[PDB]
Symmetry: D2
Subunit: 315 residues, 4 copies
């Protein structure tokens, strides 16, 4: 057995050889993950979003390694007074999958880490949080399911760890997660069918046709939590979709707090992530809360999606 | 705080005043649930079906209160040698939601309890396990999610309990679960669209139309675990569907191990459960492994389903 | 692995064949033990006496199997209104070893169970709690140490169980605890030397002489918690002593809440328990809070003690 | 609530400002402590010495921060191949209190940390492990009792932390532990009376005299585990003694693995630690396994001991 902490030490070349700093960063994360886990595992015994947001924020600050944060909850960025010397910033979705807490369904936490652009010693600015996804130095998520797992990447593969309540530590369970060769599952909220772009509606029809030669019809799976659907699709192959519609002309997902970190993780696992036309990671952020259409998973599935959008324009 | 054990004592009138026996029955269940939980919570750190099956079987026998069992795993019934004096039989689905274990997604355990028809002192026979669902004296399930919960009924409401790892006990969290007045979520594997009965395909179209006056289009949610989708729908309202198709002419779900206990639970919560035409609980079992189409959840939703099947016959 | 609950079922002949009632009795105990354990295991993260007293009292009442209780904390007995139909009474020392909580040292819980003398339907009276120790139908203790263990007897041996946090259940670890053939450890508060009876002072000198032929000098061990010193001595052999002195002319230990249950346990393990002259279990209680000199452990050691008291009278 | 990890960060001035290295050091310790804790908490469900030794050894090496270790178990020192670049060495007593495991009594782990004398890049030698106790840069212990606690010092006070199973983290419970003004408890194995030095026998008599003006007679407490007796005495005041005798002419305790770290901790808490004549920390080690008489606790008590040895020479 090998712990997350030991693993970080062992992989000295990752994270630009700044091992000591990665350790501090993930230490903040796992602590926050442990705290949230405790409250969720006894939720039965909206409000949790705030709790998660507060605990993760306090933890990151206590490591004295982050200059400031950006939360899906927060309207403005949060500058850590006394941390001006820090050279890292973190964007996060404290509790992804709000509609699942009360129903004992999987929810998660997403984080994205960037190296600041503004001079050390100075307070960070939105400039530091509006960099394209391709500049992230680290990304990962925490899934709170039957078991609690932490998944992350620095650019050298995707590593997953499972929390062991018996020990109180995160243990390595898979060092190199990769999407299998082919996917046979699509994850989308099909109730929103009539409002999806014509290309997406076509892909859905594509997915339901009878073609044993290509594993069709695919299976449908949609938990309602980006983190949990992604995690399953990554292990078993599949694609997750959340296109634009009436309620969300530019999609529902946040480009910086959700799309970018998951996109970085998908790409590092040999998958693909796009807004249906361009690479998520190369999009230049316009605003902190910018939303974006999102399609991620096995490379061939996302491609089929882009093709259908191409051949059937106009939503 | 009140424990499951204390609650059982307090409700002396339920279970036909045989309090001492209910206690023993649920004691077997929660122990099995605790054992399985432990292995699942560290699954990361098919095979689990066997483990769950063995642990639940051994636990029920050790209470010396059950004459024998029937498992979705077992081909034949299991007679407990030395328990001929027992007057209860139990049918179970040890681990519902096989495809979810490896992906850290919710799975569950389902149990159904019947009073034997054959004379005590004698070994039980299939006759004891082929009684209609309306004869069950108890039914419930265990959901292994972010938290582990046990839900059951004896005919006087549906009671849910949440396991507290800190204490090592199940605690009452909701004494009277009821479906809310209206449902706005449907749970079905839409990838199997083309093979569903025409009436079901119509209902799906119904679900996706724009009619704010009736909360349409509904939201789509499908975890892939009967226990977890049911649980969510029960708390938030909704309907779960698994009709017949090519791969399963009579549906996929087992009538005795899955449909009946969930049907008993749905009805006790003010909901409805049918095979699309008749009441699940009144169906006279033909065989131990009989499968059946299944539609369960809010009463009005299941009715809409029955109506569409009525107006559009032939699958 | 076998649980406490399963073990009770398996031993149908013990407790006068009233299996169902023993189960309810120990269920109250283990629940109280689990609750206390939780608060103690995070004590760092006098007051606990009250907490323990309240939790055990509430638990016993909730099983609707006990007519009333007597606590070392309580001045008067506690009659359970609505439990007049109960035929059992319980005397207890909720938290034995007060001076150990703040120092992270072992403490315990002691319980004694009697069958009432007064007619059912009527409220219990001190008469029910003043019966000699030889009438107990059950006795045991819970030790909260590196691990939490429950030890008890009904008259057919001493059984010990260890709590498994991973499972949340008590598991059988030893079905027949017996003192080894010989003891080589004495447990007494030697700082109180000058005030001990002359016979006890002689025994202490005896214990420190050089006589390899009899394993002397013995080893000295004194944790400060009756439960923990007893438990160790029972497994490794030894004797525990708490004689009379200035601060306590009749000893410090309570005859009914401490001496009797431990005496019943010691005798069932092949050991001996006396006040230095007579058998603890045959003493006829004079008052609820009666104190008594107490010497318990390996039979030969207690005998040596009685002999020295005999040969050197006057304290 | 503040974690051990956060506390270390917050106290940047301690440990010679080498914060990052202290963090790695204690991370190895707490992990080993968590692993051992798990096996001990289910011991019921000699051998543990080896387990503890192996787990702590593997953990320290995995942090790639220690050049090598010295264990009370090991005959020779253990050089970490591939860690020649490390500048720290650690001496340890993996499982102090062997005779307590089987009896569910408190046991502990002791560690001592030194900065090497030999050039980096080179393999460490006994020279690095034979430095006087006054050169330690860190010392502490882990007590496995009703709760699991970690206590340590770098020269700026004694800090204690309690492990929270609910969270899986160590939390600060006391930042500045100090012996109270006066002690009233002595901890010694009195069964070995006749073989103790005359001065010690006199002190024991001193301890048992009647002198309310000085809190005499003192109370006697002796758990049999150096870690647990020390911990209690530190919180409540008291003195622990283990002098020389026949079985151990130079005492039983190891000078480097036991006496030095506890001596450093006692002094940092305002207490005193000596071999009955000189300061433990200033003794120049002669051999790796050198034993030494040891007296530690409240300053005035140890002084009384030194005085009696002075006035009554010859053991
Ligand atoms: O309820 P809907 O419209 O399917 O949206 C669910 C999605 O929204 C989120 O909760 C927010 O990102 C995701 O976790 C999830 O994929
Ligand atoms: O993979 P499919 O065809 O959607 O079937 C999933 C269903 O099968 C089961 O796993 C077996 O009953 C259910 O738990 C679940 O609802
Ligand atoms: O502090 P003293 O006088 O040794 O008394 C300790 C004894 O008192 C009790 O705390 C009360 O029974 C026992 O648990 C323990 O054996
Ligand atoms: O059994 P004895 O001779 O009292 O020795 C016990 C002492 O030995 C050790 O086990 C070894 O250091 C200490 O933990 C304890 O104080």
């Amino acid at each position: 057995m090998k712990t997350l902490g030991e693993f970080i030490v062992e992989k000295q070349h990752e994270f630009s050889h700044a091992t000591g700093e990665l350790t501090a960063l993930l230490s903040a994360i796992k602590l926050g993950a442990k705290i949230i886990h405790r409250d969720i595992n006894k939720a039965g015994l909206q409000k949790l979003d705030l709790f998660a947001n507060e605990k993760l924020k306090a933890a990151l600050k206590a490591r004295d390694i982050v200059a400031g944060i950006a939360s899906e909850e927060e309207d403005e960025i949060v500058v850590f007074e006394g941390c001006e010397h820090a050279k890292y910033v973190v964007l996060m979705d404290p509790l992804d999958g709000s509609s699942n807490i009360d129903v004992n369904v999987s929810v998660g936490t997403i984080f994205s880490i960037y190296r600041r652009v503004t001079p050390v010693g100075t307070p960070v600015t939105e400039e530091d949080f509006l960099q394209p996804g391709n500049k992230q130095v680290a990304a990962g998520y925490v899934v709170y399911g039957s078991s609690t797992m932490l998944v992350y990447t620095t650019g050298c593969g995707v590593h997953a760890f499972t929390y062991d309540p018996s020990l109180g530590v995160f243990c390595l369970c898979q060092e190199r997660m990769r999407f299998p060769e082919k996917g046979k599952t699509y994850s989308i909220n099909e109730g929103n069918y009539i409002k999806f772009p014509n290309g997406v509606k076509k892909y859905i029809k594509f997915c339901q046709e009878e073609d044993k030669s290509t594993n069709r019809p695919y299976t449908s799976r949609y938990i309602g939590s980006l983190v949990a659907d992604f995690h399953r699709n990554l292990l078993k192959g599949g694609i997750y979709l959340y296109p634009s519609t009436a309620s969300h002309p530019d999609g529902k997902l946040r480009l910086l707090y959700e799309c970018n970190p998951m996109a970085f993780l998908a790409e590092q696992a040999g998958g693909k992530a796009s807004d249906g036309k361009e690479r998520i990671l190369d999009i230049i952020p316009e605003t902190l809360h910018q939303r974006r259409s999102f399609f991620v998973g096995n490379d061939h599935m996302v491609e089929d999606v882009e093709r259908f959008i191409r051949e059937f324009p106009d939503a």
